[PDB]
Paper text:
Dpy30 is an important subunit of MLL/SET1 complexes, where it plays an essential role in both catalyzing H3K4 trimethylation and maintaining the state of trimethylated H3K4. Although the structures of the human Dpy30 C-terminal domain (Dpy30C) and SPRY domain of Ash2L containing the DBM motif were solved, the binding mode and stoichiometry of Dpy30 and Ash2L within COMPASS remain uncertain, partly because the complex structure is lacking.
Although we used the Dpy30FL sample for crystallization, only the C-terminal 55 residues (amino acids 45–99) were well defined in the structure. The C-terminal domains of two Dpy30 monomers form a semi-circle hydrophobic groove, accommodating a helix with poorer electron density. We can only model a fragment of poly-alanine here without visible side chains based on the electron density map. One N-terminal helix was bound in the hydrophobic groove of the neighboring Dpy30C dimer. However, it is noteworthy that the binding site is exactly the same as that observed for the Dpy30C dimer (CD) interacting with the Bre2DBM peptide. In the Dpy30FL structure, a Dpy30C dimer binds with one target peptide; thus, the packing pattern presents a hexamer model of Dpy30 interacting with target helices at a ratio of 4:2.
Numbering used by the authors:
A (entry chain A), C (entry chain A): 45 to 102
B (entry chain B), D (entry chain B): 24 to 35, 44 to 102
The structure:
């Protein structure tokens, strides 16, 4: 009975944050804003709804 | 084999964050705090991982921001 | 707790020497001096102060 | 895919270091010793990396200098 808690580290990350990070990092590299960490963190929060629970968690 | 990375590509004067190649730009700005946050996230495995990672960035931004090519 | 010593190879180099090298290599390619290795090494030493510790080391 | 590089650009007679295209010039002069030095630097991770790399160049210049289109 595998779930998010039991997955290997890389699989866990690939299931949860890797897709939104890939998108966000690509946007960040294009924009190059004055506050990149804040920008990325903001990006995650703004776009969370489109990426959240699209994984084993269902 | 790994420490071989063509930067002769990007060079083909004054270098700042805006002019850095993509990988260098990211490595200068977010990769350190991301590496730390992703490690914390993988260990905790919280119910809201995207939110948690974003919170981690915000909470630890002060220790990582401006520690790069633009002081 | 990440620091310079713990960074992946490329991130380490990007944090420490890549920016000054980019600038120096561009100057070297423009000047084409009789002693290019010496010129580049000299460039690094002369401009070190403007690039040194502008990274995680702080 | 990678071994495809237009030099028909640069050709459009006697070739020396001064007339080489930028990438070729760098590859002829500093890329070898830089590749070696960057590898040594990444493995050691010293307190003064720019200084260390410059020192590496100076110390090993004799094994790399003039091993190119101009003997």
């Amino acid at each position: 009975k595998v779930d998010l808690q039991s997955l290997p580290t890389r699989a866990y990350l690939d299931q949860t944050v890797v897709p939104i990070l890939l998108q966000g990092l690509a946007v960040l590299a294009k924009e190059r804003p004055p506050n990149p960490i804040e920008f990325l963190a903001s990006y995650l929060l703004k776009n969370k709804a489109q990426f959240e629970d699209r994984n084993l968690e269902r």
